[PDB]
Design a protein around this ligand. Structure first.
Ligand SMILES: *[C@@H]1O[C@H](CO)[C@@H](O[C@@H]2O[C@H](CO)[C@@H](O[C@@H]3O[C@H](CO)[C@@H](O)[C@H](O)[C@@H]3O)[C@H](O)[C@H]2NC(C)=O)[C@H](O)[C@H]1NC(C)=O
Ligand SMILES: *[C@@H]1O[C@H](CO)[C@@H](O)[C@H](O)[C@H]1NC(C)=O
Ligand SMILES: *[C@@H]1O[C@H](CO)[C@@H](O)[C@H](O)[C@H]1NC(C)=O
Ligand SMILES: *[C@H]1O[C@H](CO)[C@@H](O)[C@H](O)[C@H]1NC(C)=O
Ligand SMILES: O=C(O)[C@@H]1CCCCN1
Lengths: 166, 572
C-alpha cells in the first residue's frame, strides 16, 4: 500500500483512553484542568501501577509520574496514556496489566478528583455497580398471606354467626 | 337528604373518576376530549340522571318492576340493565386486584418500580427497562407480564389470580358484614380520596414541567376534535361514571320520599362527579407533564452527549439552548464526519413525548408510582394512595354487586331454596372464576375489550330506550302531572325539552357517527406492548376477538327486543 496514514503510532496499541467530564459531575465549583491536574493524574496512575505490582505480582517497581506518557490532550479532557518500565523506555507495560491495575485502584483515582465512574471513563474498563440484594423470600407474599388469612377468618365467622342466628 | 345524596355520591365516585377518566382524556387528545365531556354533561348527564331519579320516585319500585309497570312489552329493559352490571362486575374487580398488588409491593425500601434490574453483566440496566421507564417496566412485565400480541397467550398467572381472589373475598366479606352501618363511613370514605388527591396535587404542582401537562390537558386541539370516537367515549364515560343504565339509581331513588327535590339532588350529584373527575385528572396530568418534560430533557442530554463524545467539544459547551446552531456549525465545519452519525442523531420535542409518554389502561398506576418514587417517604404515600383507590373500588363494587343481587334475592323461586349468603357466595364465585381470563399473559387485551365494549354502548341504548319509554309510551304530560302532584312543583320546561328531544337525538347521532366511522375505517385496532421498541404499537383485532366484542354488546342490547317478541308471542 503506497502512502501512509497520520493516525497510526507505535504506542497506539497499548494506549488507554481517558475521558474526563468535570462540569457535569461537579456543576459549579469545578476546577480547571491545568498542567497541575495532569501531574496529579499521572502520579495517581503511577501509584495505581505500584500498588498492582506490589499486591499481585509481589515485585517492587518504582514507577514515577514521568513514566505515564500522555498524548493527544484535547479540550474535552480526553487523552491517551500508557505506562513504560521504570527506566527502560523500550519496555511498555502491556495494556492488560494496566487495565487490571486501574480496576484494582479505580476508587482512589476517582476520589482524588472527586469524580464517580461516569465523569472519569477509561474506555475499556467498565465498572460494576454491585449485585442487588434480595430479601429472604418475598415481603409482598407475606403481606398477602396475612391479609387473605384475616379476610378468610372474617368471612368464616360471619357465615357461622349468620347461620347460627337463623 | 344527606343520606340519599351521600349514597348516590359514594356510588358514582369510584374508579371511573380517578382511573378511567385520566387515560381516556390522554388517549383522545387532552383538551380535545375535555370539551365534549362538559358538552356531553349538560345535555346527557344531568337530564337523564334527573329522569332516572324521577322514575325511581314516581314508580317507587325496582328497575324491572318500574319498566314492567310502565308496559309489559318493555320488561326486558329491566333484565338487560342487570346483565350489563354483571359484565361490569366481571372485570371491574381486576382493577382492585391490581391495586392490591401495588399495595403489597409497597413495604420495600428498594421499591420495585424505582430501580431497574441489572442487565446481567452487573454493569448496566435491562434493555427493556431502560428503553421504557422503571414504572412502565414494572407495570407491563412484573405486574401483567403482557404478551406481545393477543394471539399469543400463556397460562393463568398465579400472582394476579391470587390478587383477584383476594379482592373477591374482600368484596364478599363486605357484602356479608354491613348493609346500613355506612353512617361514619360516609363521613370518612368521602373525604379521604379528596385529602389524598390534595396531597398529590401539592406534590404534583411543584414538579419540573407541570405546566406542560396542564397545557396539554387544557388545550382543545381542533384537528383531533373532529374524531367521533372522542365524543362516543365522552358520552359513554359520563354514563359509566354516573351509573346511568345500571338500574341501581332507580332502586336508590325508590326509597326516597315523593316530597323531595330531585332537581337539586341530580344537579349536585352530577356536578360533584364532574368536579372529582376533573380534579383527579388535573393531578394525574400534572404528573404526566412532569414525565414528558423529563423524557424530553433526557433525550436532549443524550443527543448533546453523543455530539460531545464525537466532536471532542467541551464538557458544558453544548447545552439545550445552543444545540441547532452548534449542529449547523458542526455540519458546516466538516460534513464527512457528520454524515456518519446523522441517522443516529434523534429528533425529540415536547409535543410528541406528550402524546406518547404514557398511554393505556395503566396510566394511573404508572403515573402515580412515578410520583411516589419522587417522594420523601415513598412507602407511606404509596400505601395511602393505593388504599384510597382500594376504598373507591370496593365501594363502587359494593354498589354494583347490590344492583346485581337485589333482583336475585327478590325472586322467591331462588330465595325459597338457598340462603342469601349462599346466593351471594355463588355469584361471587362465578364472577371470580370467569374473571380469571384477565389474569393470563394476554389478559390485559381482554381487559381492554371489556373496558371498551362490555358496558360502553349498551348503556347508551338502555338509556335511549328508557327515555323514549318515559316520554312517548307513558306520556310526558301524564308523567309531568304525576311528578307535580308528588312534589307540588311542575317539571321545568328545560328538563322537558332535554328529556323529549335533545338527549335521544344526540344519542342517535352519536351512534350513527360511530357506526359510519367504523364502517369507513373497516379495521378495528388495539394497542399492544412492544418491549423491543419499549412502547405501544397498533395491531388489528383477530377474527375471534371480534366475535366476543360483538357478543358483549349484542346480548345486553338485544335482551330488550327478544323480551318484546316473547311478550307478543305470549299474547298471541
Ligand atoms: C527493556 O525491555 C525490553 C523489552 O521490551 C528488553 O528487551 C528484551 O531483552 C531480552 C534480553 O536480551 C530479550 O530476550 C532475548 O531475546 C533474544 C532475541 O532472540 C534471544 O537471542 C535471547 O536469548 C533472549 O531470549 C527479549 O527478547 C527482549 N524483548 C524485546 C521485546 O526486545 C530489554 O532488555 C530491557 N532493557 C533492559 C536494560 O533491561
Ligand atoms: C454486557 O452485556 C452485553 C449483552 O447485552 C454484551 O454484549 C457485552 O459484551 C457485555 N459487556 C461486557 C464488558 O462483557
Ligand atoms: C430527524 O430529523 C431529520 C431532519 O428533519 C430527518 O432527516 C430524520 O429522518 C429525523 N429522524 C432521525 C432519527 O434522525
Ligand atoms: C462490581 O463487581 C466487581 C467484581 O465483579 C467488584 O470488584 C466491584 O466492587 C463491584 N461493584 C460494587 C460492589 O459496587
Ligand atoms: O365511578 C365508578 O367507578 C363507578 C363505576 C360503576 C358505576 C358507578 N360509578
Amino acid at each position: 500500500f503506497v502512502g501512509w496514514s497520520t493516525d497510526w503510532s507505535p504506542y497506539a496499541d497499548q494506549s488507554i483512553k481517558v475521558r474526563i467530564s468535570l462540569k457535569s459531575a461537579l456543576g459549579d465549583k469545578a476546577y480547571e484542568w491545568n498542567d497541575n491536574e495532569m501531574y496529579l493524574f499521572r502520579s495517581s496512575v503511577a501509584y495505581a501501577m505500584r500498588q498492582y505490582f506490589l499486591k499481585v505480582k509481589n515485585q517492587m517497581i518504582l514507577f514515577g509520574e514521568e513514566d505515564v506518557r500522555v498524548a493527544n490532550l484535547k479540550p474535552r479532557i480526553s487523552f491517551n496514556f500508557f505506562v513504560t518500565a521504570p527506566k527502560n523506555v523500550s519496555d511498555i507495560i502491556p495494556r492488560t496489566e494496566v487495565e487490571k491495575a486501574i480496576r484494582m485502584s479505580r476508587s482512589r483515582i476517582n476520589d482524588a478528583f472527586r469524580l464517580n465512574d461516569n465523569s472519569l471513563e477509561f474506555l475499556g474498563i467498565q465498572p460494576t455497580l454491585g449485585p442487588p440484594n434480595q430479601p429472604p423470600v418475598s415481603i409482598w407474599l407475606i403481606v398477602f398471606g396475612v391479609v387473605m388469612g384475616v379476610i378468610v377468618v372474617g368471612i368464616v365467622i360471619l357465615i357461622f354467626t349468620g347461620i347460627r342466628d337463623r | 337528604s344527606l343520606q340519599f345524596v351521600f349514597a348516590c355520591i359514594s356510588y358514582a365516585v369510584g374508579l371511573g373518576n380517578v382511573w378511567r377518566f385520566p387515560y381516556l382524556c390522554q388517549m383522545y387528545g387532552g383538551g380535545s376530549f375535555l370539551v365534549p365531556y362538559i358538552i356531553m354533561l349538560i345535555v346527557e348527564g344531568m337530564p337523564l340522571l334527573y329522569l332516572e331519579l324521577a322514575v325511581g320516585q314516581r314508580m317507587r319500585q325496582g328497575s324491572i318492576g318500574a319498566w314492567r309497570t310502565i308496559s309489559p312489552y318493555l320488561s326486558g329493559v329491566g333484565v338487560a340493565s342487570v346483565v350489563v352490571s354483571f359484565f361490569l362486575s366481571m372485570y371491574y374487580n381486576v382493577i382492585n386486584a391490581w391495586a392490591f398488588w401495588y399495595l403489597f409491593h409497597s413495604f420495600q425500601d428498594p421499591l420495585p418500580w424505582s430501580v431497574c434490574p441489572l442487565n446481567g453483566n452487573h454493569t448496566g440496566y435491562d434493555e427493556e427497562c431502560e428503553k421504557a421507564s422503571s414504572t412502565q417496566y414494572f407495570w407491563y412485565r412484573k405486574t401483567l407480564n403482557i404478551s406481545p400480541s393477543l394471539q399469543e397467550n400463556g397460562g393463568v398467572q398465579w400472582e394476579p389470580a391470587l390478587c383477584l381472589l383476594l379482592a373477591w373475598l374482600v368484596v364478599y366479606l363486605c357484602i356479608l358484614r354491613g348493609t346500613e352501618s355506612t353512617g361514619k363511613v360516609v363521613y370518612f370514605t368521602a373525604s379521604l380520596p379528596y385529602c389524598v388527591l390534595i396531597i398529590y396535587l401539592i406534590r404534583g404542582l411543584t414538579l419540573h414541567g407541570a405546566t406542560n401537562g396542564l397545557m396539554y390537558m387544557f388545550t382543545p386541539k381542533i384537528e383531533q376534535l373532529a374524531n367521533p370516537k372522542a365524543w362516543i367515549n365522552a358520552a359513554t364515560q359520563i354514563f359509566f361514571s354516573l351509573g346511568l343504565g345500571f338500574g341501581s339509581l332507580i332502586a336508590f331513588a325508590s326509597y326516597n320520599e315523593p316530597s323531595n327535590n330531585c332537581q337539586k339532588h341530580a344537579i349536585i350529584v352530577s356536578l360533584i362527579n364532574s368536579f372529582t373527575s376533573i380534579f383527579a385528572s388535573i393531578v394525574t396530568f400534572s404528573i404526566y407533564g412532569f414525565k414528558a418534560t423529563f423524557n424530553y430533557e433526557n433525550c436532549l442530554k443524550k443527543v448533546s452527549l453523543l455530539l460531545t463524545n464525537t466532536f471532542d467539544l467541551e464538557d458544558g459547551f453544548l447545552t439545550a439552548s445552543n444545540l441547532e446552531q452548534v449542529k449547523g456549525y458542526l455540519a458546516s465545519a466538516y460534513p464527512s464526519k457528520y454524515s456518519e452519525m446523522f441517522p443516529q442523531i434523534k429528533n425529540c420535542s415536547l409535543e410528541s413525548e406528550l402524546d406518547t409518554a404514557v398511554q393505556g389502561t395503566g396510566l394511573a398506576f404508572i403515573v402515580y408510582t412515578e410520583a411516589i418514587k419522587n417522594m420523601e417517604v415513598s412507602q407511606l404515600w404509596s400505601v395511602l394512595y393505593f388504599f384510597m383507590l382500594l376504598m373507591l373500588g370496593i365501594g363502587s363494587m359494593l354498589g354494583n354487586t347490590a344492583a346485581i343481587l337485589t333482583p336475585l334475592t327478590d325472586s322467591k323461586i331462588i330465595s325459597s331454596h338457598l340462603p342469601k349468603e349462599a346466593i351471594s357466595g355463588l355469584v361471587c364465585l362465578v364472577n371470580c372464576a370467569i374473571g380469571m381470563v384477565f389474569t393470563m399473559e394476554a389478559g390485559n387485551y381482554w381487559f381492554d375489550i371489556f373496558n371498551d365494549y362490555a358496558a360502553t354502548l349498551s348503556l347508551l341504548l338502555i338509556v335511549l330506550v328508557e327515555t323514549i319509554a318515559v316520554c312517548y309510551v307513558y306520556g310526558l304530560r301524564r308523567f309531568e302531572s304525576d311528578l307535580k302532584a308528588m312534589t307540588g312543583r311542575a317539571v321545568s320546561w328545560y328538563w322537558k325539552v332535554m328529556w323529549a328531544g335533545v338527549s335521544p337525538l344526540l344519542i342517535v347521532s352519536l351512534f350513527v357517527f360511530y357506526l359510519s366511522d367504523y364502517i369507513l375505517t373497516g379495521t378495528l385496532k388495539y394497542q399492544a406492548w412492544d418491549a423491543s421498541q419499549g412502547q405501544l404499537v397498533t395491531k388489528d383485532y383477530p377474527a375471534y376477538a371480534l366475535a366476543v366484542i360483538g357478543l358483549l354488546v349484542a346480548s345486553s342490547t338485544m335482551c330488550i327486543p327478544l323480551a318484546a317478541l316473547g311478550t307478543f308471542v305470549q299474547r298471541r
